[PDB]
Design an enzyme around this catalytic site. Structure first.
Site, PDB file in Angstrom:
ATOM      1  N   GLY A 198       3.206   6.228   9.635  1.00 61.89           N
ATOM      2  CA  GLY A 198       4.860   5.957   8.843  1.00 61.89           C
ATOM      3  C   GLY A 198       5.137   4.862   9.669  1.00 61.89           C
ATOM      4  O   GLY A 198       6.319   4.590   8.925  1.00 61.89           O
ATOM      5  N   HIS A 222       0.825  -1.390   0.009  1.00 61.86           N
ATOM      6  CA  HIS A 222       0.050  -0.137   0.117  1.00 61.86           C
ATOM      7  C   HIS A 222       0.980   1.010   0.031  1.00 61.86           C
ATOM      8  O   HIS A 222       0.076   2.273   0.140  1.00 61.86           O
ATOM      9  CB  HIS A 222      -1.088  -0.081   1.147  1.00 61.86           C
ATOM     10  CG  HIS A 222      -0.387   0.166   2.389  1.00 61.86           C
ATOM     11  ND1 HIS A 222      -0.074   1.534   3.010  1.00 61.86           N
ATOM     12  CD2 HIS A 222      -0.324  -0.723   3.391  1.00 61.86           C
ATOM     13  CE1 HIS A 222       0.655   1.421   4.156  1.00 61.86           C
ATOM     14  NE2 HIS A 222       0.304  -0.026   4.581  1.00 61.86           N
ATOM     15  N   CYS A 226       4.335   1.859   9.000  1.00 67.74           N
ATOM     16  CA  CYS A 226       4.237   0.774   8.239  1.00 67.74           C
ATOM     17  C   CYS A 226       5.398   0.250   7.526  1.00 67.74           C
ATOM     18  O   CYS A 226       6.171   1.023   6.990  1.00 67.74           O
ATOM     19  CB  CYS A 226       3.174   1.116   7.042  1.00 67.74           C
ATOM     20  SG  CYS A 226       1.403   1.390   7.901  1.00 67.74           S
TER      21      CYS A 226
HETATM   22  C1  LIG Z   1       1.041   3.028   7.456  1.00 69.18           C
HETATM   23  O1  LIG Z   1       2.062   3.831   8.107  1.00 69.18           O
HETATM   24  C2  LIG Z   1      -0.230   3.256   8.337  1.00 69.18           C
HETATM   25  C3  LIG Z   1       0.025   2.296   9.810  1.00 69.18           C
HETATM   26  C4  LIG Z   1      -1.186   2.718  10.669  1.00 69.18           C
HETATM   27  C5  LIG Z   1      -1.616   4.227  10.702  1.00 69.18           C
HETATM   28  C6  LIG Z   1      -1.340   4.506  12.132  1.00 69.18           C
HETATM   29  N1  LIG Z   1      -0.994   3.404  12.837  1.00 69.18           N
HETATM   30  C7  LIG Z   1      -0.932   2.313  12.078  1.00 69.18           C
HETATM   31  O2  LIG Z   1      -0.701   1.387  12.464  1.00 69.18           O
HETATM   32  N2  LIG Z   1      -1.221   2.111   7.851  1.00 69.18           N
HETATM   33  C8  LIG Z   1      -2.158   2.398   7.061  1.00 69.18           C
HETATM   34  O3  LIG Z   1      -2.368   3.507   6.612  1.00 69.18           O
HETATM   35  C9  LIG Z   1      -3.112   1.313   6.751  1.00 69.18           C
HETATM   36  C10 LIG Z   1      -3.011   0.846   5.182  1.00 69.18           C
HETATM   37  C11 LIG Z   1      -3.689  -0.722   4.859  1.00 69.18           C
HETATM   38  C12 LIG Z   1      -3.730  -1.057   3.476  1.00 69.18           C
HETATM   39  C13 LIG Z   1      -3.379  -1.723   5.617  1.00 69.18           C
HETATM   40  N3  LIG Z   1      -4.199   1.628   6.924  1.00 69.18           N
HETATM   41  C14 LIG Z   1      -4.496   1.611   8.465  1.00 69.18           C
HETATM   42  O4  LIG Z   1      -3.813   1.469   9.326  1.00 69.18           O
HETATM   43  C15 LIG Z   1      -6.030   1.791   8.635  1.00 69.18           C
HETATM   44  N4  LIG Z   1      -6.629   0.608   9.142  1.00 69.18           N
HETATM   45  C16 LIG Z   1      -8.033   0.102   8.493  1.00 69.18           C
HETATM   46  O5  LIG Z   1      -8.346   0.989   7.909  1.00 69.18           O
HETATM   47  O6  LIG Z   1      -8.373  -0.945   9.095  1.00 69.18           O
HETATM   48  C17 LIG Z   1      -9.907  -1.374   8.564  1.00 69.18           C
HETATM   49  C18 LIG Z   1     -10.687  -0.352   9.143  1.00 69.18           C
HETATM   50  C19 LIG Z   1     -10.789  -0.357  10.393  1.00 69.18           C
HETATM   51  C20 LIG Z   1     -11.726   0.304  11.174  1.00 69.18           C
HETATM   52  C21 LIG Z   1     -12.719   1.274   9.945  1.00 69.18           C
HETATM   53  C22 LIG Z   1     -12.445   1.148   8.927  1.00 69.18           C
HETATM   54  C23 LIG Z   1     -11.627   0.399   8.332  1.00 69.18           C
HETATM   55  C24 LIG Z   1      -5.887   2.921   9.474  1.00 69.18           C
HETATM   56  C25 LIG Z   1      -5.436   4.160   9.001  1.00 69.18           C
HETATM   57  O7  LIG Z   1      -7.249   3.191   9.912  1.00 69.18           O
HETATM   58  C26 LIG Z   1      -7.820   3.603  11.191  1.00 69.18           C
HETATM   59  C27 LIG Z   1      -6.678   3.447  12.118  1.00 69.18           C
HETATM   60  C28 LIG Z   1      -8.882   2.689  11.829  1.00 69.18           C
HETATM   61  C29 LIG Z   1      -8.217   5.035  11.195  1.00 69.18           C
END
Ligand SMILES: *[C@H](O)[C@H](C[C@@H]1CCNC1=O)NC(=O)[C@H](CC(C)C)NC(=O)[C@@H](NC(=O)OCc1ccccc1)[C@@H](C)OC(C)(C)C
Ligand SMILES: *[C@H](O)[C@H](C[C@@H]1CCNC1=O)NC(=O)[C@H](CC(C)C)NC(=O)[C@@H](NC(=O)OCc1ccccc1)[C@@H](C)OC(C)(C)C
Lengths: 306, 306
Positions: free
Chosen positions: A143, A41, A145
């Site tokens: 960040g 991603h 990730c």
């Molecule tokens: C990358 O650096 C970042 C790391 C995350 C953000 C801050 N803490 C972390 O662990 N990761 C992402 O942006 C990641 C990308 C995906 C392709 C894996 N997305 C997320 O971490 C989101 N998670 C997510 O959408 O899970 C499914 C979901 C849960 C709840 C509601 C809708 C969907 C994060 C950004 O979403 C939050 C934390 C729920 C807002």
């Protein structure tokens, strides 16, 4: 003496953390031999995350759209591919700091150290366990990730986890280094339920052994119990069922302390049934389950690495 | 999101751990520039430990009685001296892996990472605090002596602790890198009392801020209190008195969360007076006091190092 939640020394993994940028998104990658591994991603915008067609998104990108920076040394990408949920960027130079490594998929209940990084620079290190529902309860900001989890066996680093996402719980989900998620999770910003978590019973017993070794023995009771009777208590208390395999692995702890496994099971039974009356065990007022039987043996054996 | 007790990445300190042998006793030393630092009791037998005359004992030794091994690379000792409770062995080669470093004496309540080693090889890393009674509650087996505690500020390693002894409590005592003990302890195998420990109140408040930031806010109450009224409660509960200095350092946390320090003091007051009713805060059933206000800021800021 003493018992602490201890992480592996992170030196060998620090020399592998690089910064990967694609478009405006920047995250951490792992640089081993002439390949850089990172979450796929990295290729997404904020809007792409809602519903990404990753193959499509990746086609719009060429080698030069991927900026890999190692400290300030900097790498030329000469090939790129998608393996499940990781991207692999083929670079023109081997990491001169590549440790002896291997990629391993770990099992629920196993433990590993996490090196939390941002922009390719390590921030800190802590130890944890793959929960039975395949999440981890970590410390991950925007960040982080691409930060990795690992174990070390003398000189060999077994990478087992790469961070991808936070769930709507503050728990964390990720893949092995072949890009296969642990758990039923996908890399999409869509509601995802982890499912009921359970306590890692064999780890609790190991910790209780560690407690006995360190002088804390008040919970050691009069009773014993059977595997089936204890199991009947474990499941009202959302504990994972105990198998004979678990007994066998606690064997070494059983013989160093002279306490049969089933007598510890019974002590643990009254702890589940009666609480701690506000007492503590190894400085905790909770039953602790992120120490494996090997984490215990290794900490009161003094095993070193390099 | 998420909160974990996090240690600094240990890479820069790993490249400084060597094995020091004198007679039959072997322990860990710290190799910086062309000097190796280690506990002076490396020069003692098991019998010497009961009542050592260190100056006398040291006179019986010459440079060649000190064997310094770095992995398997190996060093020539060309000078030796005793600085308080450390020995300094002048070797013929600078450590090519010497990080930018400095020696610091830390204050009670401050935190630091410990790299636990045996025979000069790192075993694991964990974070802790200098207790107000100048002990640390670590994880130290035979041969871990000479393992060091440190903080990292971007590229600069501030060494602050070297392990010397375990007390009759399973707690641990040690020196700064000038060889001055933290606490009233001496390096002799004679009964030594640590004294009454107290809880690091400003660290508890910081953790409570960290909890609010991570969604856990059930303890946030209706009340407020005064500095003097809260202090009057802190001392029945063996908490360290809160000063205006402590308020000021919690200021940043106060302004990120919008909760006045004195309202958190009052929430913490009912927690001390009423318990947790078996609830948890950030996954703990105890009030946690080994996070400084800077440990909190740094973990929800994402500060990196190298
Ligand atoms: C990358 O650096 C970042 C790391 C995350 C953000 C801050 N803490 C972390 O662990 N990761 C992402 O942006 C990641 C990308 C995906 C392709 C894996 N997305 C997320 O971490 C989101 N998670 C997510 O959408 O899970 C499914 C979901 C849960 C709840 C509601 C809708 C969907 C994060 C950004 O979403 C939050 C934390 C729920 C807002
Ligand atoms: C060095 O590697 C070793 C590390 C100790 C042993 C296992 N865990 C550790 O932390 N340290 C020593 O041998 C050290 C040497 C002194 C010069 C500092 N001695 C001790 O750790 C002893 N501590 C001690 O004697 O404290 C005073 C005392 C307390 C209780 C009763 C009598 C004297 C240890 C070895 O003594 C034990 C742990 C109390 C048995």
């Amino acid at each position: 003496s003493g018992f602490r939640k201890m992480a592996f020394p992170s030196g060998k993994v620090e020399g592998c953390m690089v910064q990967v940028t694609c478009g405006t998104t920047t995250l951490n990658g792992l640089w081993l031999d002439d390949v850089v591994y990172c979450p796929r991603h990295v290729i997404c915008t904020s809007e792409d995350m809602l519903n990404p067609n990753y193959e499509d998104l990746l086609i719009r990108k060429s080698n030069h759209n991927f900026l890999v920076q190692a400290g300030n040394v900097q790498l030329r990408v000469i090939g790129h591919s998608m393996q499940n949920c990781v991207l692999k960027l083929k670079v023109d130079t081997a990491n001169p700091k590549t440790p002896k490594y291997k990629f391993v998929r770990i099992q629920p209940g196993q433990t590993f150290s996490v090196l939390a990084c941002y922009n390719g620079s390590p921030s800190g290190v802590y130890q944890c366990a793959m929960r039975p529902n395949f999440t981890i309860k970590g410390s991950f900001l925007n960040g982080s990730c691409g930060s990795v989890g690992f174990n070390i066996d003398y000189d060999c680093v077994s990478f087992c986890y790469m961070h991808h996402m936070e769930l709507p719980t503050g728990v964390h989900a990720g893949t092995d280094l072949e890009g296969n998620f642990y758990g039923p999770f996908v890399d999409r910003q869509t509601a995802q339920a982890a499912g009921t978590d359970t306590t890692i019973t064999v780890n609790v017993l190991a910790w209780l052994y560690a407690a006995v070794i360190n002088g804390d023995r008040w919970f050691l009771n009069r009773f014993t119990t059977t595997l089936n009777d204890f199991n009947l208590v474990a499941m009202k208390y959302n504990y994972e069922p105990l198998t004979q395999d678990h007994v066998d692995i606690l064997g070494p702890l059983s013989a160093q302390t002279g306490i049969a496994v089933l007598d510890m099971c019974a002590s643990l039974k009254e702890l589940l049934q009666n609480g701690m009356n506000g007492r503590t065990i190894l400085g905790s007022a909770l039953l602790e389950d992120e120490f494996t039987p090997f984490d215990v043996v290794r900490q009161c054996s003094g095993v070193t690495f390099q």
